[PDB]
Design a protein around this ligand. Structure first.
Ligand SMILES: Cc1cc2nc3c(=O)[nH]c(=O)nc-3n(C[C@H](O)[C@H](O)[C@H](O)COP(=O)(O)O)c2cc1C
Ligand SMILES: Cc1cc2nc3c(=O)[nH]c(=O)nc-3n(C[C@H](O)[C@H](O)[C@H](O)COP(=O)(O)O)c2cc1C
Ligand SMILES: Cc1cc2nc3c(=O)[nH]c(=O)nc-3n(C[C@H](O)[C@H](O)[C@H](O)COP(=O)(O)O)c2cc1C
Ligand SMILES: Cc1cc2nc3c(=O)[nH]c(=O)nc-3n(C[C@H](O)[C@H](O)[C@H](O)COP(=O)(O)O)c2cc1C
Ligand SMILES: CCCOc1ncccc1CN(C)c1ccc2n[nH]c(C(=O)O)c2c1
Ligand SMILES: CCCOc1ncccc1CN(C)c1ccc2n[nH]c(C(=O)O)c2c1
Ligand SMILES: CCCOc1ncccc1CN(C)c1ccc2n[nH]c(C(=O)O)c2c1
Ligand SMILES: CCCOc1ncccc1CN(C)c1ccc2n[nH]c(C(=O)O)c2c1
Lengths: 330, 330, 330, 330
């Protein structure tokens, strides 16, 4: 069928995936208050476009942690991509290479670090890391990322335990993940990881300014403002609503990124107006895989790219450097 | 059937137009957040009527850019009127002549500038203009408007590219329009147009006070606060909500007008209380054409006129000069 | 059937009245924004009950314009009561006599001033007045009210013209009323009426503090904060929301009353906490007549009385003198 | 069936109880505005979790009125437990003994004070008291609570009369309760009860800071911020919304508790962040009994315990002493 926006990709995925797999991907934690809010919050921020600026030649390119990208829209870590499409993470990395954007690989990816680097040798690639109770396997992942040309580590800090998604309980794996992830992870473990690698490290899952300041103090290189796609603690705010406090807190010392609820080009524009360098998408990528593997991911990323180009042009922004805080008001 | 308010005209149009044509007229951009808000915002502004003022002889007349009109309710530019009714823009201009109000003719009208002036020789007529990549045809339209007795140019400034209306993609023309409209349009092109004609020029599609001030600085003669009927950038505010900032910004130097969401006489009263000189209606006119051509447009304009008369009388306003800011609070 | 609250009476009335008659009674003006708000606004004001006050002997009695009543809940003027029940206004006045509360008789009542006084000789009775273009018949009504033992005039000031209720247009009388009511009514006509009678006069339909102050300056004896049951100008605020401004404006010089949306005993308590002396009910009385004439009106008034007694007791109020502004917050 | 959250227990109870019994348990007063708000209010308070704190060993234990409990989640008084399950209050007290939390026994319990103490000899048990018109039976209950090892009296102060639950009227007992409960109860009766027993006394049903201060002045030992599960006066605020004012008012002199709307572990966390020592649950316990008596109550309490453990861990709280006001914002 004819899919023209990200919601059409979700609707198609619901129509072709087994219910248990669609529910795993769609679900948030508990009553899904934050899942609704990640989307509703973007709608509350209103755009104040400038007219007559000359937007004939819109340039979406930017950089993430010193590496050039084609657009401020990157693929976030999502476990279990092979349940959406046989090609899983290799399909995703091939789409990212085509688009000129970066892929954050889950540390629970079915495809190995090496396999993804072999499928996307020229793709910008980052590794998402959990600090596992087994620090030997944690270290081995970081060293493999270094050796295979990955350009940053995104350490997930909001998952001492996995969240309670009610459909997953109504429909093994979760127990095996709980056995592996360390609930004792502290700032001392961040000091260890900062000593372990010279790669840029981003703290993924920060929601408070004081924690963002502590990440800067520990010599990390970025914050990804994230509520884990509303899958961890329900009743946290929308990421777009905490973004301004986090940008204020880090005083320009490190790049700030956002995920959670990005579905449209205007969502990207609002996040950049509030000070994010770039945004990451989770579920939209899975819906792309479910439609048509590599070509479906490419289509989702091209829809977001073109929606973002149009939103930039209609708001009077030739390039991402002129996106400013006066474009948005809540 | 018996149609007694503007929403009844829309419902009738949905019942008789081909789905693709109804959807073209009804649709807003993307998720249609602004389309809903243009209407909902009017409901948030509450009326504080004065009693016992003597409203036996209500006078709705006013002026637009120095020309007398019967009511502060005028017809906005809407392309493709011949898809609603065979008589298209000639039906509309004949209704405007009957009512004593003005018609803004789209520059993509099926009827020529001359043909409309021949159908409505005594009608107040304005030309809506896009600055086309072809500046020769742009100049020719302005000269034809001058020669055929049009009294102002409304230059549309919010359309460097056309918006993404999802139903139009689900259901050629849009490509031909994208080929013609210039995305490079800047304030330098406004200086060119201000030098090209002595007619009054109104900037249509301003949403920011700073842009309104720049339009005054370039010697334009009015601002039409407009989000293009919520068809361009989705997630901009409702026009009624940005109107007060724009009125404040221009410090009484030029007339300020409003379109977007006007469906009822109380909408007209709220816009005038917040400082608009007059309001324009888009979609209601198309629904009038779909019902009964000239007589349907006349009926829609008479419903709005009489709703407005009643709202003025119930709020204690004998004429538009006594409509003041204390009538409304958000 | 078993009707235990005012909404059950409405539901029963919808089930037994001809659609055109139910719609006439239920309807508000235009899109019915104020009709919804008159009810929703009461829900936004929250109650802060005091505990342990000794509410064994609750006393609901008060006074209206110097006359004792059994409860601060009185019957408002509603035209056309004989369309709900053959006994119409005689049923209503007999119920008011039983309850010990007052009845405001519409000046468009089917039963004459004399007939109502004959049915309810010991009932507290007031006359609602329109200043008719025919000042002779206006004067004759006031003199008949004086002669037949009525204790006040409620002059309706929000109806220069009748409102636009869409169902009445979809389903004669309205034209005959428009022919009779004077749209020229001004404060000069209030000076005339204040000279015409020594009875207490209440201005019914004031929504602004400045108009309330003008009513005090003209020697009127009360304000009834009213939007005519949301049937006149749509998009005015809820009466409960403007009540505090009007109470503030009159500085205790005259009694302030409220109608619009009273359906429950807690509505009565909120209006008294915000400074109203008493409240009036319109539609609930008509639903009572539709159920069972006099006995139905008596039942509606007894439900409101007992709901109000319970709300007073649960909030720690022994009598209406201890109802204070700290009981409510918006 | 597989019940994994408290709402699933309610849905199951609706499926197995007679409608009249389900409606008795579910219902709130009048239009049930407060019943909806007790739940909606928790959703408006947002959580600001701290990351990287080391939550490997979460400790939920606390104390209530000097007695250790396993978790800050206790069973509130609910009359008529034997209508949900044959074992009624004996099932409930056996579940509380298993969990290591306390049970507040209704003074209208079917099981006697002695019978409950015999079923749960090692359970933490409190008596909820009404001051009955018969002060002899009131005194006898307090003495029996003392003799049978109960550790506090919760005196209910928001019930001079029972509330108006509309389904109970649509579907005897209520008349017998109205005959027994004294509407004259004042602060003088609290002085009497404070002289009658040396047990800790908690005032249950306070919604105002000034009343909370008066309870402290009368030598009571705690406040239970309660609106009686929204069953008394409708249109009072949600308990979570008045909690902060009550905590502020008592200046740390006495413990403050909350009930009303607790359904999830994040509700418990929000109440403790705003200064409650512990929370009580009413309806969830009845749904547990309806499912499977003692084992159903145990399951409900274990679901709340584990939800609360997870919410504490995901918010960076090792124990209840580190739960602070910066975790929440409205
Ligand atoms: C199915 C699924 C699997 C995910 N797996 C991971 C993971 O393994 N590691 C991780 O750090 N984040 C994971 N996330 C969270 C995402 O990285 C990101 O925070 C979130 O998906 C963004 O929200 P969105 O889905 O609304 O874009 C996952 C999210 C989803 C929906
Ligand atoms: C079907 C349609 C066609 C339109 N065509 C034009 C156009 O050619 N030029 C223009 O400046 N505005 C155009 N507009 C925008 C209107 O001039 C106006 O901004 C808008 O219709 C007002 O909102 P309303 O439809 O809620 O009244 C169009 C709007 C619609 C709905
Ligand atoms: C059917 C109907 C007839 C009414 N007739 C009159 C009238 O003749 N004169 C008048 O002053 N107000 C009239 N009112 C307005 C009421 O006096 C009062 O303002 C309103 O009914 C109160 O709102 P409620 O219906 O929500 O209680 C009427 C209202 C209704 C619903
Ligand atoms: C069916 C039912 C019976 C109750 N019986 C009593 C009672 O006998 N005494 C009392 O003090 N509170 C009683 N309550 C109120 C509870 O103690 C508590 O305030 C309320 O249930 C908490 O709200 P929740 O049900 O949302 O948890 C009762 C509540 C319900 C729902
Ligand atoms: C149909 C697939 C069901 O896959 C699961 N079901 C239950 C639990 C875990 C998984 C998958 N795994 C291994 C992970 C691993 C790390 C993760 N980080 N975040 C998430 C998430 O889902 O939000 C993670 C999921
Ligand atoms: C059934 C008719 C489909 O007509 C189209 N369909 C798609 C694209 C364009 C058109 C019509 N044309 C030529 C224009 C021209 C200028 C415009 N300015 N604003 C609009 C608008 O629709 O908001 C414009 C539309
Ligand atoms: C089925 C009955 C239809 O009765 C009508 N139908 C239409 C118009 C008038 C009436 C009734 N009349 C005579 C009046 C007279 C004075 C009034 N003041 N307020 C109202 C009101 O309805 O709000 C009034 C109605
Ligand atoms: C199917 C059972 C219907 O039980 C009733 N029906 C109506 C009235 C009373 C009861 C039960 N009784 C004796 C009590 C006694 C004290 C109470 N305190 N609060 C409540 C409450 O329901 O909120 C109370 C109920």
């Amino acid at each position: 069928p004819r899919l023209i926006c990200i919601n059409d990709y979700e609707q198609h995925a619901k129509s072709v995936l087994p219910k248990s797999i669609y529910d795993y991907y769609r679900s948030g934690a508990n009553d899904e208050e934050t899942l609704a809010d990640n989307i509703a919050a973007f709608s509350r921020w209103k755009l104040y476009p400038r007219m007559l600026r000359n937007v004939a030649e819109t340039d979406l390119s930017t950089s993430v942690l010193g590496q050039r990208v084609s657009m401020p829209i990157c693929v976030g870590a999502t476990a279990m991509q092979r349940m959406a499409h046989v090609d899983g993470e290799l399909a995703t990395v091939r789409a990212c290479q085509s688009l000129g954007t970066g892929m954050m690989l889950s540390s629970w990816a079915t495809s190995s670090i090496e396999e993804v680097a072999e499928a996307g040798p020229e793709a910008l690639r980052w590794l998402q890391l959990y600090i596992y109770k087994d620090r030997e396997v944690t270290k081995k992942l970081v060293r493999q990322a270094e050796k295979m040309g990955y350009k940053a580590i995104f350490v997930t800090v909001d998952t001492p335990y996995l969240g309670n998604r009610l459909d997953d309980v109504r429909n093994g794996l979760a127990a095996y993940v709980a056995k592996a992830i360390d609930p004792s992870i502290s700032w001392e473990d961040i000091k260890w990881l900062r000593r372990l690698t010279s790669l840029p490290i981003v703290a993924k899952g920060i929601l408070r300014g004081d924690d963002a300041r502590e990440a800067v103090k520990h010599g990390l290189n970025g914050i990804l403002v994230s509520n884990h796609g509303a899958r961890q603690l329900d009743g946290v705010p929308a990421t777009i609503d905490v973004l301004p406090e986090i940008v204020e807190a880090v005083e320009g010392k490190v790049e700030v990124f956002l995920d959670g609820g990005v579905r449209k080009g205007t969502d990207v524009l609002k996040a950049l107006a509030l000070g994010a360098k770039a945004v990451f998408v989770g579920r939209p990528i899975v819906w792309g895989l479910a439609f048509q593997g590599e070509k479906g991911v490419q289509d989702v990323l091209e829809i977001l790219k073109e929606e973002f180009r149009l939103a930039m042009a209609l708001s009077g922004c030739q390039n991402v450097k002129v996106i400013d805080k006066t474009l948005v008001r809540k």
